[PDB]
Enzyme design. Structure first.
Site, short mmCIF file in Angstrom:
data_model
loop_
_atom_site.label_atom_id
_atom_site.label_comp_id
_atom_site.label_asym_id
_atom_site.label_seq_id
_atom_site.Cartn_x
_atom_site.Cartn_y
_atom_site.Cartn_z
N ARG A 55 -68.51 -55.32 -51.28
CA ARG A 55 -69.06 -56.01 -52.44
C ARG A 55 -69.37 -57.46 -52.07
O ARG A 55 -68.69 -58.07 -51.24
CB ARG A 55 -68.08 -55.95 -53.62
CG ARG A 55 -68.38 -56.91 -54.77
CD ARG A 55 -67.27 -56.84 -55.80
NE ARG A 55 -67.11 -58.08 -56.54
CZ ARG A 55 -66.17 -58.27 -57.46
NH1 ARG A 55 -65.31 -57.30 -57.73
NH2 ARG A 55 -66.08 -59.43 -58.11
N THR B 299 -63.00 -54.45 -58.76
CA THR B 299 -64.23 -53.66 -58.76
C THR B 299 -64.99 -53.89 -57.46
O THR B 299 -65.03 -55.02 -56.96
CB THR B 299 -65.11 -54.07 -59.95
OG1 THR B 299 -64.31 -54.11 -61.14
CG2 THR B 299 -66.25 -53.08 -60.17
N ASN C 139 -60.80 -56.35 -68.54
CA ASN C 139 -62.14 -56.27 -67.96
C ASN C 139 -62.30 -55.00 -67.12
O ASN C 139 -63.30 -54.28 -67.25
CB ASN C 139 -62.40 -57.51 -67.10
CG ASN C 139 -63.76 -57.47 -66.43
OD1 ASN C 139 -64.76 -57.07 -67.03
ND2 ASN C 139 -63.80 -57.86 -65.16
N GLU D 83 -54.15 -59.56 -54.04
CA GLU D 83 -54.43 -58.91 -52.77
C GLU D 83 -53.71 -59.59 -51.61
O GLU D 83 -53.46 -58.96 -50.59
CB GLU D 83 -55.93 -58.85 -52.51
CG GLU D 83 -56.67 -57.97 -53.49
CD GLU D 83 -57.20 -58.74 -54.68
OE1 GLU D 83 -58.18 -58.26 -55.29
OE2 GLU D 83 -56.67 -59.83 -55.00
C1 LIG Z 1 -59.15 -62.12 -55.98
C2 LIG Z 1 -59.68 -61.15 -57.06
N1 LIG Z 1 -59.03 -60.02 -57.26
C3 LIG Z 1 -59.44 -59.14 -58.18
C4 LIG Z 1 -60.59 -59.44 -58.96
C5 LIG Z 1 -61.09 -58.42 -60.05
N2 LIG Z 1 -60.73 -58.82 -61.36
C6 LIG Z 1 -61.37 -59.79 -62.12
S1 LIG Z 1 -60.78 -60.08 -63.61
C7 LIG Z 1 -59.66 -58.93 -63.34
C8 LIG Z 1 -58.64 -58.62 -64.42
C9 LIG Z 1 -58.79 -59.56 -65.65
O1 LIG Z 1 -57.55 -59.50 -66.37
P1 LIG Z 1 -57.20 -60.66 -67.38
O2 LIG Z 1 -56.90 -61.92 -66.61
O3 LIG Z 1 -55.99 -60.26 -68.17
O4 LIG Z 1 -58.44 -60.89 -68.35
P2 LIG Z 1 -58.90 -59.87 -69.50
O5 LIG Z 1 -60.06 -59.04 -68.99
O6 LIG Z 1 -57.76 -58.97 -69.90
O7 LIG Z 1 -59.35 -60.67 -70.69
C10 LIG Z 1 -59.71 -58.31 -62.09
C11 LIG Z 1 -58.76 -57.21 -61.64
C12 LIG Z 1 -61.25 -60.66 -58.71
N3 LIG Z 1 -62.42 -61.03 -59.45
N4 LIG Z 1 -60.76 -61.48 -57.76
#
Ligand SMILES: Cc1ncc(C[n+]2csc(CCOP(=O)(O)OP(=O)(O)O)c2C)c(N)n1
Ligand SMILES: Cc1ncc(C[n+]2csc(CCOP(=O)(O)OP(=O)(O)O)c2C)c(N)n1
Ligand code: SF4
Ligand code: SF4
Ligand code: SF4
Ligand SMILES: [Mg+2]
Ligand SMILES: [Mg+2]
Lengths: 1163, 501, 167
Positions: free
Chosen positions: A111, A28, A999, A61
């Site tokens: 961000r 995000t 999320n 990333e």
């Molecule tokens: C380095 C980094 N990349 C991307 C993100 C964005 N981000 C945070 S949580 C998330 C996905 C969460 O997935 P999961 O670990 O399965 O937890 P869930 O929400 O399914 O419980 C993403 C894409 C981030 N905070 N930091």
């Protein structure tokens, strides 16, 4: 053509046309770019090369950046989209991509970086952290500029061979909807330097004309080789300038490396970057028209910084400059742009007073009144330097005073605010309304949407603008012509009518008549309506939706009411455009669903009623507020103002300097959002406490009490005799918290009694009664009970230390964590990865983790998305060190003249400091003897006892818990998780496996199964689910277990206790149903039961301790499935949307081979 | 006592004493710090807390950085050693560690970043990429300063709650062997703020007094919450200054946030950082004695940049300043230290011509003749700006011309070069000779060793110095009193007798 | 492998008599698997651009022998032996086919000749030590293997960090 897009779509539009490959990882607010690019490819959109863009999702990333580097070096034009923590992980490869002079564009929705706290919102911290990588940096200030400057970056990088970061303000521009001129792909191809593309292909890695790149160099040639790229950086400004001339000739919009706006003879000038330039120019027009000699320099090309292009647009009359940076570099002399401006002016001998300030951190509002405050500081005798704008800094006094309020909005601009409820359709309708107005009138149209931290039942505020002039108002609406409230509960709760103009419109959705208005509306609202002579309209949209058969959906109804009164377009034209959009939205739903929404439009027109209010409403007087209860300082000074949407008024002195928050604060929220709540039937209850186990919000609990403690109980607090030898002579009652219940209905579905002991009744009908019931149950004294905690019934008599979080109704994650706190919460520390569990577990200012009657409860910390395993690993090292320091002082006490009982408890603790029960038993003994032992000592012996008391919080052995989602465990943090498990440390890893990125809206993960449809897997995931548990079993000394609460309560209890008691690394992979699966959240527990019964989710336990006892470490807890695998896929929308048949057959074959492999490990 | 150490060992000596945990991942040229700390723990060396340092190796420096964060947040004093690509992977957690105001010291053997090519050698590119994390940044210019300023950072970070990057030039200082005054662990413990350590323990994550940290925040409070740490950064310069005075009273060596050397009436001044300060001061002594009005400002505390302490040591007669940055930020208007110096002088209305240049990338030689060329450019009618020294830039013409060759080595300094064969024992013997000479005479002793990437059969050139005066010659030997050729094959192949007196 | 494989200024990788040989690139320590993955995507993109131009040549007035080699290459572009067989045939017929062409047909043939270095199927090799594969780059290696890409990973397992002295 003209289309209404947001920054992300505008950026992806150009990136898609100009690129062959896009290697991405979601974050995000940049992930919408990668999502829409994946959708366009899925439908076959062609780029300027006649092909569809190839979108590849990596594990992080960092993996995306390396893929960009490899794709570029091998001859493919490649782009990516990222932001914030994602941009940080790409920085190492950015040095390589620039060092190798590879054409490239990173699109960044800028961000904030995670510092004292995480923030998904916009500022330039991420881009500024990469300004030394050698990438060029181009800033877009509006959605139109995102479209144009994205094309400039893609065109310039091919000519210059210098890669570009094209960034725009996160949310404030990336999610702002605007009607813009969209550039045709065919027109892009006419501007591309095709010779530069072909030369790029010739430099590619190819075995038929090979070369070597990325060598290692000694001191003799490294410096020279690094300076050899100087001509490319010296030429990039001129190249970017010339590309801007190409875009100008095509579009008519003229960009420069630095642009000037304002008085030609201005003496005070602001230098700024990003969307702030829009706000400043609108203010400059207003001030210049009033005679002030002010101006603005917009920074487009931040890197390379061309002094020649900066000075050419700086008027010779400038005497004072304020530089605005959307970032903070703590301890720095100044922020980056301020130091650039100060440097260039010194290099050219300009005698100009320069001052730098900070603004808009984390999407902090930056409006025209703040812009004037910056200009006023330039007009002071001694301008304040190193200032801030938009906050009240009462500690270090850096903030500028907002003296007066100005309205710089261009005349003729219509302004509307819509207060909606989470997922009630308001935001979606307003987006459709902007599309309608933009597509069918000459007016510019703008939309910005403020969301809530609560996932269900949150507040949404839509900000819409339409006008005959371009909309540069990159800020929230101050003076609204129309205000709509789509939820009557907000009446009396939020300042809805704030800033509405005299004679404006107030549209309300409620069942109240004009006479009931006097009693339902607050006095302040009635005063505003009368004094400003507002046109007050009301509509009972729920009544219309009920009678037509649309349920409670009011999105079509409220949108129809808006156009009926707004006078933005002809009412007849609006009705056609609405019905045309209904065909586009509900055409596939069927003929019956179509005509119902058609009837919604028709009935909405006739039901809109104007409220003729008496003029005496202006003199109404507030009612005497009741005697408020004495609440803690944090709740009174922080939590309430934030929830009242007034957090921006909090000065700097309000907050801790390090982002530390109290625990147990969600119990003060009492949102009361449930439509139905469980009502307990004492006669049907078997006292099994399974309802308390499955509640995702700890809103229903069992209560035991001696009959004497039921004295002041209300008459409705009906109890029952307690079943069980442990609770003999006690009373039992299952009590629900009505204001904390979500109405999900899991407890009623799990209730195993013959006749249901829990029935869903409307909240409003029983709310007054059950509030008195809950208030008495909550104040009941503690009851010492000997129920076995290893059972489901016994564990639920332990207090839940995770309560009332912001997770969705029926969330499949929180019941797991709640149960862990009931078993070991007294002594556990949580390292929580970024994701859902960090959002409902740790969104400021409310903490769902709480303490027991002794004040003990889980300590909670979230570091990053990628580091959570190593984060908790570090905690384990520290806790072990602190116990070692305590053990050293206790061993010294054995040589000290202290009481025999003290030495007895000390020897007992030293022998059992590594046992959970024994360390608490002897630890509590030492704590009981310490105050008396210190009193009887003196001198150095007294100090030895005081050092034990100083460290008494480490007597009880701690339980480190590393909690995170499947995206963390399977992808970005898998490398770290693998290492921590291999280390052998005594940590407990709990993976809440939702098989998606829950999320961020539901993106693909390695935990996603075959055929499951998620974002970045539009056609279904082909590769099977990665078996994280199987890889952890390869070490042999890692406890691994696969659990599912909905399938087996006892198997979940058995694995949790075995994993925590195991002196080593433990991994719990828990099946967590989620709203992204496309199922009824009322039956969330039931869906986990069908998952195991259909062979979709396995239940096993791998105990390394069994190997030392001569037994088989692998135990298969569910061997023979009884349900059909194909039928379980049919129960979730994430699989039915594929219908495709080939993926269903592949998913069933993988489940049989996985089950047969588990049979082999057990046999 | 006096011992002959290198920069890495001098840093590890202090880091070991002041830390309980060290979560590490190896990377040249910082890994010798983690290796020797691992050996000391295996041999039972006690820190000031009476226990051995716990060294834990992670899967990467990213895993190391996260482990530091968790170890700090749970109440253990934690350090780490890194450089170059390793420091980059720690940057995300550095934002957290600074944001949460956790005491910490990162010891960095500053090394080039991988750009057009990988380079294991020294410059400040890695440290400059983290200058916006909120860490304090303290630069030591010599092995003795590595010993002293490592103690300053460890003492200051406890008092200020702001974590420190203590960095020293990779190879040029990290692998330079020098006889130095070693500070006793018992004396370090006598200066520590034990109250600050106990307060750090009270803030730790613990279920018996729990708290929440690392929340997610909306636009309503994030900006204010970020500015709430301003007092800690405003106080860090004064805290570092006072800690430097404690070390001054203990050792007699007086450090300041900015130090000045040269003529009191200097008109041309170089502002620099790291081991270049040693080369420049040696040159300044030579020029001042020749009558030239030149001076040098050594930057010790780079972040937070204290304008008050910079202007405090800037002579009022200065008319022209050359700033030297040991890094390159392509496309930037100027390099970081140059933009800091340019900004602070503008904020105080000083009419001083300031010019910035780049030097020593990837351990490029930086000798007194280059220092004079920088001074000569300040004396020109139109000084060249945005320049380079030590290379010949015949494409963009940024390099300064090395007009004349000067020998600024203090007289009485013995200088020896040893041409050896790969792993033939020459380097090991020369190290033992430095220890022998350092342990049994009053002379200062210095050793620097030029290696090859080949593990066997490469050419090695040892540069050794002994003298009655401190050896600030952080550059290769110019005029050798003795030259030894340990391989007959080199005769007729290399210019062995080059520059012999 | 990067120190003895790519230390400036000497490159140990060399070419055959036709001038063909391995092209060598090193990015970082942690990203090597994803690095080669990106190369695999790019090469596939470059062969698709060539294959599109060859299919247009089937629709063009060119010699029958040229069309026969194009059909054989289009059928075997993903086989190492078959793509080389028909690829070398196209290379032998290109100079004469261009000589007999004019206008858009000549441009179409020159576009084949511009991309003839992608006729032979490429073989992507991702080479690194045990420290890369087991530790710092394991997460990226795990993901690239799970992707299914046609890459060849060679782990030179010395069971230590050989380059840095043996950690
Ligand atoms: C380095 C980094 N990349 C991307 C993100 C964005 N981000 C945070 S949580 C998330 C996905 C969460 O997935 P999961 O670990 O399965 O937890 P869930 O929400 O399914 O419980 C993403 C894409 C981030 N905070 N930091
Ligand atoms: C991000 C990063 N961390 C650490 C290093 C230092 N480094 C380079 S190679 C290497 C170890 C090489 O081990 P291995 O992968 O087994 O290859 P080998 O030399 O043994 O063949 C290390 C620690 C680096 N260059 N980059
Ligand atoms: S309905 Fe849902 S939220 Fe309410 S008590 Fe039952 S399980 Fe808990
Ligand atoms: S699930 Fe039903 S029977 Fe069991 S405790 Fe709850 S209300 Fe009683
Ligand atoms: S995991 Fe799913 S159900 Fe739970 S809070 Fe997140 S989105 Fe909602
Ligand atoms: Mg998930
Ligand atoms: Mg190896």
């Amino acid at each position: 053509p003209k289309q209404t897009l947001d920054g992300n779509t505008a950026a992806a539009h150009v990136a898609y046309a100009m690129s062959e490959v896009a290697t991405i990882y979601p974050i995000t607010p940049s992930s919408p770019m990668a999502e829409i690019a994946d959708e366009w490819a899925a439908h076959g959109r062609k780029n300027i090369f006649g092909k569809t863009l190839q979108v590849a999702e990596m594990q992080s990333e960092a993996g995306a950046a390396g893929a960009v580097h490899g794709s570029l070096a091998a001859g493919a034009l490649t782009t990516t989209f990222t932001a914030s923590q994602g941009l940080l992980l790409m920085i190492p490869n950015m040095y390589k991509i620039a060092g190798e002079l590879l054409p490239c564009v990173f699109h960044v929705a800028a961000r904030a970086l995670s510092t004292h706290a995480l923030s998904i919102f916009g500022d330039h911290a991420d881009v500024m952290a990469a300004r030394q990588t050698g990438f060029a940096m181009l800033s877009s200030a509006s959605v139109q500029e995102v479209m144009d400057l994205a094309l400039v970056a893609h065109l310039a990088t091919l000519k210059a061979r210098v890669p570009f970061v094209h960034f725009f303000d996160g949310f404030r521009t990336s999610h702002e909807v605007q009607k813009i001129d969209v550039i045709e792909y065919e027109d892009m191809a006419k501007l591309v330097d095709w010779d530069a593309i072909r030369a790029f292909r010739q430099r590619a890695l190819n075995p038929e004309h090979p070369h070597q790149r990325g060598t290692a160099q000694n001191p003799d040639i490294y410096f020279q080789s690094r300076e050899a790229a100087n001509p490319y950086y010296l030429a990039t400004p001129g190249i970017v300038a010339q590309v801007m001339e190409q875009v100008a000739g095509l579009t008519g919009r003229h960009y420069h490396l630095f642009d000037y706006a304002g008085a030609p003879d201005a003496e005070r000038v602001i230098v700024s970057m990003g969307s702030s330039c829009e706000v400043i120019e609108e203010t400059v027009n207003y001030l210049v028209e009033k005679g002030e000699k002010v101006g603005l320099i917009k920074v487009r090309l931040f890197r390379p910084f061309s002094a020649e292009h900066f000075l050419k647009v700086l008027p010779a009359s400038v005497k004072r400059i304020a530089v605005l940076d959307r970032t903070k570099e703590p301890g720095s002399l100044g922020e980056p742009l301020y130091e650039d401006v100060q440097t260039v002016l010194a290099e050219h001998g300009k005698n100009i007073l320069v001052v730098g300030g900070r603004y808009g951190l984390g999407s902090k509002e930056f409006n025209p009144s703040m812009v004037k405050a910056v200009f006023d500081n330039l007009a002071a005798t001694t301008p304040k330097n190193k200032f801030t704008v938009g906050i009240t800094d009462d500690v270090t006094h850096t903030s500028l005073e907002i003296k007066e309020h100005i309205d710089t909005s261009p005349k003729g601009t219509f302004r509307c605010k819509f207060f909606g409820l989470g997922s009630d359709g308001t935001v979606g309708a307003n987006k459709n309304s902007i599309k309608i107005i933009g597509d069918h009138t000459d007016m510019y149209a703008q939309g910005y949407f403020v969301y809530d931290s609560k996932k269900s039942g949150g507040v949404t505020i839509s900000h819409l603008r339409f006008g005959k002039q371009p909309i540069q108002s990159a800020y929230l609406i101050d003076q609204a012509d129309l205000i709509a409230c789509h939820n009557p509960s907000y009446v009396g709760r939020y300042n809805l009518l704030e800033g509405i103009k005299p004679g404006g419109i107030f549209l309300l959705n409620s069942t109240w008549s004009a006479e009931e208005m006097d009693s339902r509306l607050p006095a302040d609202m009635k005063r505003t309506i009368a004094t400003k002579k507002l046109k007050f309209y009301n509509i009972d949209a729920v009544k219309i939706a009920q009678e037509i058969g649309l349920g409670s959906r009011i999105n079509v109804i409220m949108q129809t009411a808006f156009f009926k009164i707004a006078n933005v377009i002809p009412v007849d034209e609006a009705i056609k455009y609405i019905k045309d959009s209904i065909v586009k939205t509900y055409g596939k739903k069927g003929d019956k669903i179509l005509n119902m929404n058609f009837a919604a439009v028709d009935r909405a027109l006739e039901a809109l009623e104007e409220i003729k209010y008496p003029a005496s409403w202006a003199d109404a007087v507030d009612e005497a507020a009741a005697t408020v209860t004495e609440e803690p300082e944090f709740i009174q000074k922080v939590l309430r103002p934030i929830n009242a949407l007034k957090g921006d008024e909090l000065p700097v002195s309000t907050f801790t300097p390090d982002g530390v928050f109290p625990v147990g604060t969600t119990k003060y929220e009492k949102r009361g959002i449930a439509v139905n709540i469980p009502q307990w039937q004492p006669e049907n209850c078997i006292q099994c406490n399974q309802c308390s186990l499955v509640c995702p919000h700890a809103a229903i609990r069992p209560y035991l009490a001696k009959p004497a403690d039921l004295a002041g109980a209300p008459e409705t607090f009906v109890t029952k005799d307690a079943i069980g030898k442990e609770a003999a002579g006690l009373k039992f009652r299952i009590q629900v918290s009505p204001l904390d219940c979500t109405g999900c209905g899991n407890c009623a579905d799990v209730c195993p009694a013959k006749v249901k002991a829990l029935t869903m009744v409307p909240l409003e009908e029983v709310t007054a009664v059950e509030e008195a019931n809950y208030n008495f149950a909550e104040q009941l004294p503690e009851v010492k009970v000997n129920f076995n905690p290893a059972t489901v019934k016994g564990s639920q008599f332990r207090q839940p230390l995770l309560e009332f979080s912001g997770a969705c109704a029926g969330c499949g994650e929180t019941p797991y964590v709640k149960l862990v706190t009931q078993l070991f919460g007294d002594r556990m520390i949580i390292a929580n990865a970024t994701g859902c569990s960090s959002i409902w577990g740790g969104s400021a200012p409310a903490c769902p983790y709480t303490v027991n009657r002794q004040g003990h409860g889980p300590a909670w910390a979230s570091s990053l998305f990628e580091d959570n395993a190593e984060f908790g690993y570090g905690m384990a090292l520290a806790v072990a060190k602190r116990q070692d320091e305590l053990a050293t002082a206790i061993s010294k006490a054995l040589e000290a003249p202290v009481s025999a009982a003290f030495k007895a408890a000390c020897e007992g603790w030293l022998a059992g400091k590594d046992d959970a029960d024994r360390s608490r038993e002897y630890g509590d003994r030492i704590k009981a003897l310490l105050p008396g032992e210190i009193s009887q000592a003196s001198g150095e012996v007294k100090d030895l006892l005081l050092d034990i008391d100083r460290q008494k919080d480490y007597l009880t052995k701690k339980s480190i818990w590393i909690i995170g989602g499947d995206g963390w465990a399977y992808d970005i943090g898998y490398g770290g998780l693998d290492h921590v498990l291999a280390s052998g440390a005594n940590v407990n890893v709990l993976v809440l496996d939702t098989e998606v990125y829950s999320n961020t809206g539901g993106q693909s993960s390695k935990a996603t199964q075959t055929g499951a449809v998620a974002r970045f897997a539009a056609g279904g995931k082909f590769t099977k689910k990665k078996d994280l548990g199987l890889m952890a079993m390869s070490y042999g000394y890692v406890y691994v277990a696969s659990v599912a609460m909905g399938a087996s309560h006892s198997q979940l209890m058995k694995a949790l206790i075995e994993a925590e008691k195991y002196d080593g690394p433990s991994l719990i992979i828990a099946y967590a149903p989620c709203i992204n699966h496309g199922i009824n959240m009322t039956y969330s527990q039931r869906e986990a039961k069908k998952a195991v019964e259909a062979g979709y989710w396995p239940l096993y336990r791998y105990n390394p301790q069994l190997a030392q006892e001569g037994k088989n470490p692998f135990i298969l807890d569910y061997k023979t499935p009884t349900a059909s695998f194909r039928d379980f896929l049919m129960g979730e929308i994430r699989y039915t949307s594929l219908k495709a048949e080939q993926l269903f057959a592949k998913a069933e074959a993988d489940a049989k081979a996985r089950l047969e492999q588990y049979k082999k490990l057990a046999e």
